[PDB]
Amino acid sequence: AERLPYDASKWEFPRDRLKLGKPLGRGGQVIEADAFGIDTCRTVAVKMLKETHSEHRALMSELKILIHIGHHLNVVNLLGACTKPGGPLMVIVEFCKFGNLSTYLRSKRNEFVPYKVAPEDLYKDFLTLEHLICYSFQVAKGMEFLASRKCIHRDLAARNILLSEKNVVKICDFGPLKWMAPETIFDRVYTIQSDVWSFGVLLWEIFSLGASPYPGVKIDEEFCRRLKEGTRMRAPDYTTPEMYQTMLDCWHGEPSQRPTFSELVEHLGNLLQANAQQDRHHHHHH
Ligand SMILES: CC1(C)CNc2cc(NC(=O)c3cccnc3NCc3ccncc3)ccc21
């Protein structure tokens, strides 16, 4: 990463081939944009610094980390960068027009059935348990990929998951105590296992169809103490019993007792296969 030089021949993109559009977030800022000849004209998301040496290294590190990590279907894809003199540092990635998963699920609350049967058009475009388990499975394969390369996300949450074309989700980072593991809060310790705690919170978000975690709770000292003491969220409204138990496994007090992402990939894959088998029967009988 920060040790591996930046290969300009491969990634460098001309600033004048970029037409900056509207903001997607502001914190540096992330804006939508049209890129000509990046891969003729295509939509992309750009992260650029304001017109600070520290903030500069941060964006440059994100860039180097992205090149290093490489490609995976469930991780937003890097397309290029503007790093040479003449203008601001810019990191360009594929644009996901559908936005973050939380806001998307929140918009489908009146379009959900656990599964479909004929006539299926009654549920055209509805979300189902298959979709929810599939989103979870994809994020897990995405994190397994990152974990295999020793990468730690730090802010894994629904707002950082993006929806793509055919129900494909991608892990991103626009760059939140409610998603933080106890040891992260009390010890400022970040590890792959603290990302597992977060995944657990993401699962809750998914099976509550975009609700904000810990509903009706002030995030004060008591919240933190209870978390440390073993208090957990109750099951969301659209969860199956297995999925809620998986959340609980991710919220184990001892980081070493939580499952790994490889185990979650395998486990979620099975819950998906079971759900599918159940569905074929439901469909065949009704
Ligand atoms: C998790 C990790 C591998 C480490 N850091 C990081 C950063 C990103 N970067 C972005 O997600 C990003 C970069 C530049 C511009 N926008 C970004 N994300 C916001 C976005 C992405 C796609 N569509 C709309 C908004 C992606 C993945 C990772």
Side-chain angles (χ1 to χ4, degrees), residues 24-25 29-32 44-48 59 61-63 65-66 69-70 75-78 90-97 99-100 143 145-146 151-154 160 162 171-175:
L24 291 163
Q29 51 170 50
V30 183
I31 64 283
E32 195 178 324
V44 310
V46 184
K47 193 176 290 186
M48 61 169 250
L59 183 49
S61 287
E62 177 172 319
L63 171 57
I65 286 177
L66 281 179
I69 289 182
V75 174
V76 71
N77 202 42
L78 175 72
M90 293 181 281
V91 175
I92 312 163
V93 307
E94 71 183 321
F95 178 68
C96 299
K97 60 178 184 176
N100 81 75
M143 289 304 302
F145 176 76
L146 292 182
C151 181
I152 308 179
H153 190 295
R154 278 162 170 278
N160 272 323
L162 306 177
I171 296 164
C172 82
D173 184 358
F174 286 76

Side-chain angles (χ1 to χ4, degrees), residues 205-248:
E205 285 182 289
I206 290 177
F207 290 85
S208 68
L209 288 181
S212 75
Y214 301 99
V217 174
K218 185 177 183 181
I219 309 308
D220 58 13
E221 184 176 351
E222 293 300 78
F223 163 81
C224 293
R225 197 198 63 190
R226 304 216 201 73
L227 203 65
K228 173 214 293 291
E229 311 244 306
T231 302
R232 303 302 190 248
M233 264 185 278
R234 297 177 182 178
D237 301 334
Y238 311 82
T239 195
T240 52
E242 304 66 37
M243 205 62 62
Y244 181 55
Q245 178 56 62
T246 291
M247 282 166 222
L248 298 186

Side-chain angles (χ1 to χ4, degrees), residues 99-134:
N100 81 75
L101 185 64
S102 174
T103 305
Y104 174 73
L105 298 184
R106 190 125 34 79
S107 91
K108 306 292 288 173
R109 296 199 177 181
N110 298 167
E111 300 184 74
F112 174 100
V113 255
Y115 59 85
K116 309 172 177 183
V117 295
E120 295 199 354
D121 52 49
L122 180 61
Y123 331 102
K124 183 191 171 182
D125 297 311
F126 271 39
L127 281 192
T128 70
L129 279 175
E130 191 176 303
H131 292 75
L132 302 189
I133 300 173
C134 180

Side-chain angles (χ1 to χ4, degrees), residues 6 20 23 25 29 34 62 86 95 136 142 170 219 265:
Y6 164 67
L20 300 180
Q29 51 170 50
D34 292 329
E62 177 172 319
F95 178 68
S136 308
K170 303 187 182 308
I219 309 308
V265 168

